[PDB]
Amino acid sequence: HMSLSVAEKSYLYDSLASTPSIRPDGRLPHQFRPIEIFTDFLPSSNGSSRIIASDGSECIVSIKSKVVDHHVENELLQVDVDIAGQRDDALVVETITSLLNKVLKSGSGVDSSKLQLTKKYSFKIFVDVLVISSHSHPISLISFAIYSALNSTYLPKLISAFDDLEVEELPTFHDYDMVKLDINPPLVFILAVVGNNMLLDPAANESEVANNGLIISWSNGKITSPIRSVALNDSNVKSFKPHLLKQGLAMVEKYAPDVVRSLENL
């Protein structure tokens, strides 16, 4: 996104590619920038969140539910990604959409048992993402918002019996009463590769000079798929040694619980 001159980029590379790596800001290779998160502001929805970054990057997530027959509806969690002033079709949109749907699959990184109502019916979860503004790869930004939203989601409570095979009662839900959606949303961390250094939460200027990048998912206190290498820019993309890949996975594996801990506060 950001446009920089050849001189500025080289200086940034020198600052960040140094053996004692220094952020232009001054951050450490594992320090995130401060974010603000709002939740439960959309009463029309079952759950909602709004995340604001330090560079003005803003993302809004909404959670809606629908009763479906899990015998015909394979995917019980659908992620939808959007950006105002941006066409839906764009390569970045579909890629993030495809990626996010894999991160939150029914039988991969999500306890889909908590969505089951009866033998025959279950709750389909629609996770709608709206990226108002972003200056870098918003994959990690969206991930934090989806997490916050799914941890403050409330679904209707069933009243009728849960055996459609025999008695076959029509799904009825008691008025007013609702049950909080107990689930373990995964997180998606993005890393930047500048020389032999690995940075958590790459800034805009940092990503521009990066040699490569990593997209690493996180669930149940361990590294999980999808794991994707990603070109943060397209002018300075280079191959990387395998030890860097193992360094990145190790880096996430030790700093993720700290992030989750700061994120798990109700």
Partner: protein, 213 residues
């Protein structure tokens, strides 16, 4: 639809040892082309890669080249359009390190990869991950056949859903694709795909020598 002939809209669709074959330069419509066919067990994959470029962009001030990759469904409609865009983004993240961009200022290279077929057999009492190393093989051949300068030969392998692309004789990595499968397969997949890379590399080099001869 006023663009194509979709037919009746009230109707419904139908409801019910590694071996390689390489051929390049069989299309006179573009600057470089490649055919890749792989058969393992009951599963086989045949795809065609077409390269158009490098062609000048009017008014372009870019000091380097610009690569665009798009995957298409030739016959069987299986893979989602959203997923095709994702792989395309992954593929471009690879060849932007492979292709010597400094050679083509104010220019752009368009890469079309037609997935005409893949055959899948599943027994009854990811998916596109297996095709990825073949797409990389096809593109690297089509680019080298077209005359595009490549810093190194790009190749990859698929091990338990974990795809990783290598250059500089497996010493470094230009791409990494992990979906599902199992944990703690880091060291194993890196070694198994490195063998597939070296195997795919030599056959790719021999391919150019054969057709070029």
């Amino acid at each position: 639809d006023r663009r194509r002939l979709l037919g009746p809209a009230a109707a419904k669709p139908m409801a019910f040892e590694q071996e390689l074959s390489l051929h390049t330069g069989f299309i006179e419509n573009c600057n470089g082309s490649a055919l890749v066919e792989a058969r393992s067990l009951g599963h086989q994959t045949s795809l065609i890669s077409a390269v158009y470029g490098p062609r000048s962009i009017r008014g372009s001030f870019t000091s380097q080249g610009t690569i665009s990759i798009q995957l298409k469904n030739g016959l069987l409609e299986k893979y989602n359009t959203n997923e095709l865009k994702e792989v395309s983004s992954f593929l471009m993240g690879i060849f932007n390190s492979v292709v010597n961009l400094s050679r083509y200022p104010k220019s752009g290279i368009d890469i079309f990869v037609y997935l005409t077929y893949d055959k899948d057999l599943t027994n009854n009492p990811s998916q596109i991950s297996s095709l990825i190393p073949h797409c990389i093989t096809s593109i690297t051949l089509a680019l080298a056949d077209a005359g595009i300068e490549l810093v190194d030969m790009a190749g990859a392998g698929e091990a338990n859903g974990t795809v990783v692309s290598f250059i500089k004789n497996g010493e470094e990595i230009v791409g990494f694709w992990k979906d599902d499968g199992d944990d703690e397969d880091l060291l194993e997949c890196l070694d198994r795909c490195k063998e597939q890379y070296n195997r795919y590399r030599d056959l790719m080099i021999s391919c150019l020598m054969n057709q070029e001869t």
